[PDB]
Amino acid sequence: SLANRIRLHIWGDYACFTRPEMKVERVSYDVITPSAARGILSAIHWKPAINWVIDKIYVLKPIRFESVRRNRAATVLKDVAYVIEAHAVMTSKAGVDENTTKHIEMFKRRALKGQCFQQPCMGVREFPAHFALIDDNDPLPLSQLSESEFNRDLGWMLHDIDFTPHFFRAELKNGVIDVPPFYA
């Protein structure tokens, strides 16, 4: 539904969504994972009553990498921006009659102020994620993606972990990655 839906514009000069299979040195995935996106949303607003579910990731800027020094080196994304489209689900630990409305409204209110509970980051603590709510009557940023980077098979990527990793087939279709339901 439109009532249970948020859009958050995020950007940063650097990002590192670490690929789990590359163990020698830290190497980022090509785009933000659902896992990292959900972290970013939860940093703005979270309570045990709810879980944020990622629906779409809009990729706005060309995929580019730089090797940078770790305080050792890591290969990280440079100059990223996304839109995260998500909704809330109630957990088994929610109030008997509780709904998503107050949580959606609190998320948006916090986000509009540029406020956050803990600073969101782009995959690793050293890279902060700047953010802006895309409220209902604001437009989506335009993609700056190459006609030829608009559609890309990103391959198997971490969807999320149960603290046990679960992967999904990430496909960029006209600048957007649709994220399937986490559970089987």
d(CA 87, CA 4): 5
Q: Structural domain of residue 99, as residue ranges? A: 1-184
The token pair at 160 is: 């999320």
- Closest-CA residue to 63 (of 142, 132, 127, 151): 151
d(CA 29, CA 10): 17
The token pair at 76 is: 């990280």
Angle between helices 34-44 and 101-112 (to 10 degrees): 80
Question: 42, 52 in Cβ contact below 8 A?
Answer: yes
Please enumerate, as own/partner, the contacts of 22-29 that have beta carbons within 8 Å and a separation of 24 or more: 25/72, 25/73, 25/74, 25/75, 26/70, 26/74, 26/75, 26/76, 27/74, 27/75, 28/65, 28/74, 28/75, 28/76, 28/77, 28/123, 29/154, 29/157, 29/158
d(CA 31, CA 80): 8
Beta-strand pair 176-178/65-69: unpaired
- Residue written as tokens 């603590």? 125
C-alpha distances in Å from residue 131, one per residue of 43, 60, 123, 143, 180: 11, 14, 14, 16, 24
C-alpha distances in Å from residue 52, one per residue of 2, 68, 103: 15, 32, 10
Neighbours of 83 (CB within 10 A): 22
> How many folded domains does the chain comprise?
1
Report the Cα 52 to chain-centroid distance in Å. 11
Rg of the chain over CA atoms, in angstroms? 16
Method used for this model? Answer: X-ray
Angle ∠(158,160,164) on CA atoms, nearest 5: 95
Question: 34, 57 in Cβ contact below 8 A?
Answer: yes
Expressed in Å, this structure's resolution amounts to: 2.0
d(CA 12, CA 131): 9
CATH code assigned at 151: 3.30.70.2660
Strand partners, 81: 11
